[PDB]
Enzyme design. Structure first.
Site, PDB file in Angstrom:
ATOM      1  N   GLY A  67       0.655  -1.353   0.142  1.00  0.00           N
ATOM      2  CA  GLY A  67       0.005  -0.044  -0.052  1.00  0.00           C
ATOM      3  C   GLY A  67       0.928   1.438   0.024  1.00  0.00           C
ATOM      4  O   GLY A  67       2.076   1.239   0.459  1.00  0.00           O
ATOM      5  N   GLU A 110      12.981  -7.607  24.987  1.00  0.00           N
ATOM      6  CA  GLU A 110      13.414  -9.106  25.276  1.00  0.00           C
ATOM      7  C   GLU A 110      13.172  -9.690  24.045  1.00  0.00           C
ATOM      8  O   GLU A 110      13.875 -10.490  23.658  1.00  0.00           O
ATOM      9  CB  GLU A 110      12.526  -9.901  26.156  1.00  0.00           C
ATOM     10  N   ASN A 167      -7.037 -12.913   7.652  1.00  0.00           N
ATOM     11  CA  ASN A 167      -6.924 -11.846   8.672  1.00  0.00           C
ATOM     12  C   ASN A 167      -6.848 -12.669   9.820  1.00  0.00           C
ATOM     13  O   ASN A 167      -6.180 -12.651  10.823  1.00  0.00           O
ATOM     14  CB  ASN A 167      -7.653 -10.573   8.739  1.00  0.00           C
TER      15      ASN A 167
END
Ligand code: GTP
Ligand code: ACP
Ligand code: GDP
Ligand code: FW9
Ligand code: CA
Ligand code: CA
Ligand code: CA
Ligand code: CA
Ligand code: MG
Ligand code: MG
Ligand code: MG
Lengths: 425, 54, 349, 438
Positions: free
Chosen positions: D143, D254, D228
């Site tokens: 995009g 971390e 999704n």
């Protein structure tokens, strides 16, 4: 995201009218502007081409232009005549007599200002103006001469908006006057500089289709406009109807135009109509890639495809389209440029056009379109090397050198098209 | 193949198992380059509006 | 129809494979760098494996196995053998070998060298590379240091291999030889051995003391066709096929080619190719692979077979190009892209 | 407790953000109204789920999220959606016309007219953070907003929040689900300008999700919705250690420590198993060893590559639901024997492991079946460089002819940013090869 439509001249206004007949029926709006349809999908993207007015009525965002009132009296007369906001009928009286110079410099200049006043009042009432579209011929005077004049004026007021056109090319097989190659060459140079997408609708191809394959002995301007309106609807469905595409005029331009001057697309359509047998998906795709379904009278196999787009309309297997589209590419993979990866894109919309359960619209950006400009260019020189019929133009103020330049600019364009047709990775 | 650092709780546990041991630009220079491309645009639009004036 | 491209123009074998596929009428060749292909016949080095299997709606196949170089480059070949439990320090068909850099095995090598010096054993040795083509950069000494300085003579890696002092020598001629076998591995890791092999003869009589001689010892096709008088006397092209070698062993030694050698050949082929099967198989990958290998062996006078090397871009013998290249298509290609007896011995596993 | 703010950019980023936050709510027992019955610290708290949600006096639990598109059609569906009540309007930001798949239009032209506002609405969330950790930025590579505006945002977060970590979730472009041919341009330009502003990025090749959805869910032509909900399951397991009690990857710091030795090479490969269809009424539930060894089949990876022909630098295993350390070691031991898992010499050949006992939560009516145990593996292997190579090649092909370049120059960019950015990935592609071959 609203679009402003303009139709100029006889041809421009009669294909323009058929366009509004077609889609108005597709979105379910009647000749009075009152919606009476079955689906909400008909209205979700209705603001693209229609202003919503008092009392539930939808009025096209359209401006009708001609230098004589003849055929725009006929538009107001026609099936959907009263659909259009009457203030948007803008016309002179003297006519342009198939003269580019009259439309662009003298008779047209007298009226252009009035037209852009209506443009501004449609724009001002636009949430976010997306761009403009024009319908017109290139072989007459008003649609050609004035049409290209308005485009230059619109690029001046709205320099960052998209301007696309539907442009009818002149062919001897369907000829009004002999000066058409002059008017078309002078217009093409304008379109090269100031449009983002131009759909080359060749009256030669429209004739060949109507007579050879549709087997109509004597084609009328009406029979040729049926093909134009069906294609204009097929093209515009990416925006007129809700896919799960986020289709934007600018975005579509970006994905199909690799070079600014090479924005002249070959249109196509399938099945070709004037029957009841359901058409297989494999048959839809092999037809739209066959030259016999091209609206631009060029063989795609003497050139190479820069970009392609295929619109399938109807309820079909999105898996069978992917299957056979990716199949045709290999029957023809020698004819796709290899330096633009994945340059064939497919779209689907569930709602089909009235009369057919399945349809496909072909939009191709081929370097074979040069065959069209070579054809216009030869007819041009054939007369210009004898200064034939120039007096009609020099009498309106133009000089021979404006002709020499316009000729030179498109011989340049043809050369640019063949640079990328021989180019390789 | 050692296990080590075993920490547990009510939601789960974690650990590590070893199989073998081993053998920025400014603010002003951004919004300047945002501005250096804004003028490159207004120069291109001026050459057009100049062209159209011709 | 099916699509393929060609990115190794100098490949003798896949030259006819491409031509034979064109005569199919069902295969279309494209330009070298068009990506919409079903089959690639790729370059020998830096073949872009990462670019394959990412073209929607196109099953792609390639004629090389990513990772096969660990078997077809003599330095890694040795490393693969001694480091892999499947082959092991304990490997009876591969000569004692050491990798030496001009990780390095310089004094593990001389260790084994004087344990042989000590006991009057044959301290025969030879150093090698995959870099030198046309029999270049070879050196068969009997004392250790004469090559180590010829090794660091140059800047690239060379392996040192025990030379086979007692090779089996055909008669008439008292000549040496090596055997080349062509093995094809298809996309399902079926191991197909070509029924036809070749004996790449030497036409010199063999001389123990005279390792000065360039051509008394080395058997590949070019070193006896442009370095030796005797090329072509006993057999055409210093090439003896399997029917003659069998009958000779029958008449001469009262045995068969299958029994005395081929069983050991098939054992070595399948032992090598399945040692690495986990590292190169394309069973569940997005693209699939096949590859033709050339296995080179040598036979000592006890009728024991030794593996000398494996070649990844191999040339065939001119009589069999037709039969072999046709077998590739039937098994490696049209097996995946079907159309409108068998020359191969399947080595099962 | 330390908060993390998620930023979703462009269509792909927003729609994925919508799917993730849907799942987060189902997992933590939050309802579409923002009410958490199981939360007894009314209107406040410093639980581990509070890292992603804030609380109002009325008991509302609100994502620390920000959505931003340059055109309103997609964020409008959020403002009318099932979880409309969850967010409040200042978090959802819309322009009027988008970047038309043009990095230059998204970064330069439309970007600068909205960058100050976005940053203002971002700081209205950080001002309610006692000790902020950083940001998780969702966006597409292809995009014009996803690529162009994100790189502009990531540039000024590195100054307005110089000491905070920034993790990316990036959608690598695939032609099977994309209608744009200039995505190779946009991905190169955004990676180049964003690279030294992102601490760790997880990239998801739509191609891999597509084929996973086709193979293991038998959906013939997957939608973005299909893609999704599966993507968010992965993202969910990756962020679970920040939202839940644990000892591993409890802080965005971390992530760089455990997974990223060299900063440039901060693109870990994610592999996930098992993916089972909900139409398969019932299924022979797979063991620990079966799902753990599935983590080395390229067919379950988020990017199709071959980790056998690279070398690892770090590896985490994040089991979800019902797993015990000893069944993992059983599996790990058996896998080393049969797989080609080579590490770089300057790194340990080890596996950091994390278990949370809550099984994977799945959307009611989704396409994914409930499972007793699942795992997501995070591997920093050099084999992911294959994805850069593919992209870089498609870039070389068009740019050699300058195709489509005029669209970017017309928005202010200079032709040199193309070769400057391509030169960067030339270095990146070779950085990988230095690390993972001999
Ligand atoms: N996985 C996934 N990919 C998506 C989704 N939406 C778009 N994409 C991918 O992203 C690319 C299109 O980029 P978009 O996110 O739509 O563009 P944008 O970020 O809105 O920026 P603009 O160009 O201004 O519209 C295509 O390659 C798609 O494959 C989505 O919901 N999920
Ligand atoms: N340990 C050894 N004992 C005896 N002879 C040996 C030997 N190692 C090599 N040779 C001889 O060296 C010759 C060729 O060596 P080698 O095959 O490895 O080089 P190369 O790979 O460049 C030729 P090709 O690529 O055609 O196979 C063999 O024919 C063999 O006779
Ligand atoms: N397809 C089509 N072409 C037309 C039509 N009318 C005119 N033309 C074309 O345009 C030329 C005549 O130009 P015209 O449209 O009358 O010019 P104008 O009215 O003065 O602007 C001829 O070459 C025709 O091919 C029409 O109704 N349909
Ligand atoms: C007046 O001018 C107009 C008016 C309306 C539409 C168009 C138009 C349609 C079109 N359709 C093909 C297509 C390409 C890429 C795609 C796609 C569909 O869906 C997603 O990606 N392409 C282009 N270039 N312009 C032009
Ligand atoms: Ca007048
Ligand atoms: Ca005025
Ligand atoms: Ca609480
Ligand atoms: Ca930083
Ligand atoms: Mg007329
Ligand atoms: Mg060799
Ligand atoms: Mg968008």
């Amino acid at each position: 995201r609203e679009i402003v439509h303009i139709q100029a001249g006889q041809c421009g206004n009669q294909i323009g009218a058929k366009f509004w007949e077609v889609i108005s029926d597709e979105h379910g709006i009647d000749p009075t502007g009152s919606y009476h349809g079955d689906s909400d999908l008909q209205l979700e993207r209705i603001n693209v081409y229609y202003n919503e007015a008092t009392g539930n009525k939808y009025v096209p965002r359209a401006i009708l232009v001609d230098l004589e009132p003849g055929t725009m009296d006929s538009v107001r007369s026609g099936p959907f005549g009263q659909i259009f906001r009457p203030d948007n009928f803008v016309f002179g009286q003297s006519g342009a007599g198939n003269n580019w110079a009259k439309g662009h410099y003298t008779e047209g200049a007298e009226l252009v200002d009035s037209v852009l006043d209506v443009v501004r009042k449609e724009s001002e009432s636009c949430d976010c103006l997306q761009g403009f579209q024009l319908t017109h011929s290139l072989g007459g005077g008003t649609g050609s001469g004035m049409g290209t004049l308005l485009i230059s004026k619109i690029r001046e007021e709205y320099p960052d908006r998209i301007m696309n056109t539907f442009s009818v090319m002149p062919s001897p097989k369907v000829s009004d006057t002999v000066v058409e190659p002059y008017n078309a060459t002078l217009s093409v140079h304008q379109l090269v500089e100031n449009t983002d997408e131009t759909y080359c609708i060749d009256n030669e191809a429209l004739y060949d289709i109507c007579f050879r394959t549709l087997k109509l002995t004597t084609p009328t301007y009406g029979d040729l406009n049926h093909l134009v309106s069906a294609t204009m609807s097929g093209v515009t469905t990416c925006l007129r109807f809700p896919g799960q595409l986020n289709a934007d005029l600018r975005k579509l331009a970006v994905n199909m135009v690799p070079f600014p001057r090479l924005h002249f697309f070959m249109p196509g359509f399938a099945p070709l109509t004037s029957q009841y047998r359901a058409l297989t998906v494999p048959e839809l795709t092999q037809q739209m890639f066959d030259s016999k379904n091209m609206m631009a009278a060029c063989d795609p196999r003497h050139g190479r495809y820069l970009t392609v787009a295929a619109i399938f309309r109807g309820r079909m297997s999105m898996k069978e389209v992917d299957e056979q589209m990716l199949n045709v590419q290999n029957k023809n993979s020698s004819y796709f440029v290899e330096w633009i990866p994945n340059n064939v894109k497919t779209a689907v919309c569930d709602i089909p056009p009235r009369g057919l359960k399945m349809s496909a619209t072909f939009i191709g950006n081929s370097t074979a379109i040069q065959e069209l400009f070579k054809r216009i260019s030869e007819q041009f020189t054939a007369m210009f090397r004898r200064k034939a019929f120039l007096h009609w133009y020099t009498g309106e103020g133009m000089d021979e050198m404006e002709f020499t330049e316009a000729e030179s600019n498109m011989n340049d364009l043809v050369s640019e098209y063949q640079q990328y047709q021989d180019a390789t990775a | 193949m050692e296990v080590i650092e075993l920490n547990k709780c009510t939601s789960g546990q974690s650990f590590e198992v070893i199989l073998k041991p081993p053998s920025d630009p400014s603010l002003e220079e951004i919004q300047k380059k945002l501005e250096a491309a804004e003028e490159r645009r207004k120069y291109q639009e001026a050459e057009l509006l100049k062209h159209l004036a011709e | 129809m099916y699509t393929f491209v060609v990115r190794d123009e100098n490949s003798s074998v896949y030259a006819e494979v491409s031509r034979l596929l064109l005569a199919t009428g069902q295969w279309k060749r494209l330009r070298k760098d068009n990506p919409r292909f079903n089959l690639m016949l790729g370059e020998r080095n830096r073949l872009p494996f990462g670019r394959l299997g990412h073209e929607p709606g196109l099953v792609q196949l390639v004629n090389y196995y990513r990772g096969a170089d660990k078997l077809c480059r003599k330095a890694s070949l040795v490393k693969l053998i001694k480091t892999s439990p499947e082959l092991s320090e304990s490997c009876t068909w591969f000569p004692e070998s050491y990798v030496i850099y001009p990780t390095d095995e310089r004094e593990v090598f001389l260790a084994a060298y004087n344990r042989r010096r000590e006991g009057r054993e044959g301290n025969v040795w030879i150093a090698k590379s995959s870099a030198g083509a046309k029999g270049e950069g070879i050196l068969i000494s009997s004392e250790a240091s004469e090559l180590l300085d010829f090794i660091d003579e140059q800047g690239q890696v060379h392996v040192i291999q025990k030379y086979l002092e007692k090779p089996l020598l055909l008669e008439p001629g008292h000549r040496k030889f090596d055997i080349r076998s062509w093995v094809l591995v298809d996309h399902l890791y079926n191991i197909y051995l070509y029924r036809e092999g070749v004996l790449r003869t030497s036409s010199e009589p063999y001389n123990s003391a005279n390792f000065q001689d360039k051509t008394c010892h080395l058997t590949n096709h070019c070193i006896q066709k442009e370095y030796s008088k005797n090329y072509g006397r006993y057999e055409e092209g210093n090439e003896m096929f399997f029917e003659e070698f069998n009958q000779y062993l029958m008449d001469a030694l009262n045995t068969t080619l299958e029994n005395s050698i081929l069983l050991q050949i098939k054992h070595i082929i399948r032992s090598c190719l399945m040692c690495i099967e986990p590292a190169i198989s394309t069973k569940h990958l997005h693209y699939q692979s096949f590859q033709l290998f050339g296995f080179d062996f040598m036979v000592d006078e006890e009728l024991k077979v030794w593996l000398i090397e494996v070649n990844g871009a191999p040339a065939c013998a001119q009589k069999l190009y037709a039969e072999l290249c046709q077998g590739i298509v039937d098994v490696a290609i049209s097996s995946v892209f079907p159309l409108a007896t068998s020359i191969f011995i399947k080595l099962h596993h | 407790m330390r908060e993390c703010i998620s930023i979703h950019v462009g269509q792909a980023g927003v729609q994925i953000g919508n799917a993730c936050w849907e799942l987060y709510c189902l997992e933590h027992g939050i309802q579409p109204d923002g009410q958490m019955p199981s939360d007894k610290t009314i209107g406040g708290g410093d639980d581990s789920f509070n890292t992603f949600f804030s609380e109002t006096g009325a008991g509302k639990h609100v994502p620390r999220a920000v959505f931003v598109d340059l055109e309103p059609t997609v964020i409008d569906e959020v403002r009318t959606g099932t979880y409309r009540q969850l967010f409040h309007p200042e978090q959802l930001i819309t322009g009027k016309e988008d970047a038309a798949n043009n990095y230059a239009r998204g970064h330069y032209t439309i970007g600068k007219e909205i960058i100050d506002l976005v940053l203002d609405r971002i700081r209205k969330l950080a001002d309610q953070c006692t000790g902020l950790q950083g940001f998780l930025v969702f966006h597409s590579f292809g995009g014009g907003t996803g690529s162009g505006f994100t790189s502009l945002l990531m540039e000024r977060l590195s100054v307005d929040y110089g000491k905070k970590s920034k993790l990316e979730f990036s959608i690598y472009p695939a032609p099977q689900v994309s209608t744009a041919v200039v995505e190779p341009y946009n991905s190169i330009l955004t990676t180049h300008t964003t690279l030294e502003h992102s601490d760790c990025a997880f990239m998801v090749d739509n191609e891999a999700i597509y084929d996973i959805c086709r193979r293991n869910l038998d959906i013939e032509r997957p939608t973005y919705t299909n893609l999704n909900r599966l993507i968010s399951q992965i993202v969910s397991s990756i962020t679970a250690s920040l939202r839940f009690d644990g000892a591993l990857n409890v802080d965005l710091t971390e992530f760089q420590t455990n997974l990223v030795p060299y900063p440039r090479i901060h693109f870990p490969l994610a592999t996930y198993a098992p993916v089972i269809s909900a139409e398969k009424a019932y299924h022979e539930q797979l063991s620990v060893a079966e799902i753990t060894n599935a983590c080395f089949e390229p067919a379950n990876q988020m990017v199709k590559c071959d980790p056998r022909h690279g070398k690892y630098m770090a590896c985490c295993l994040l089991y979800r639901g019902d797993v015990v350390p000893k069944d993992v070691n059983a599996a790990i031991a058996t896998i080393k024997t049969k797989r080609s898992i080579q590490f770089v010499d300057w790194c340990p050949t080890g596996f950091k492991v994390g278990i949370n006992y809550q099984p994977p939560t799945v959307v009611p009516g989704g396409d994914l079946a409930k499972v007793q145990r699942a795992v997501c593996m995070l591997s920093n292997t050099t084999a992911i460089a294959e994805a850069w190579a593919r992209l870089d090649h498609k870039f070389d092909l068009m740019y050699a002819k300058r195709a489509f370049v005029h669209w970017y120059v017309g928005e202010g960019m200079e032709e040199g940013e193309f070769s400057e950015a391509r030169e960067d990935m030339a270095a990146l592609e070779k950085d990988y090869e230095e690390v993972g071959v001999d």
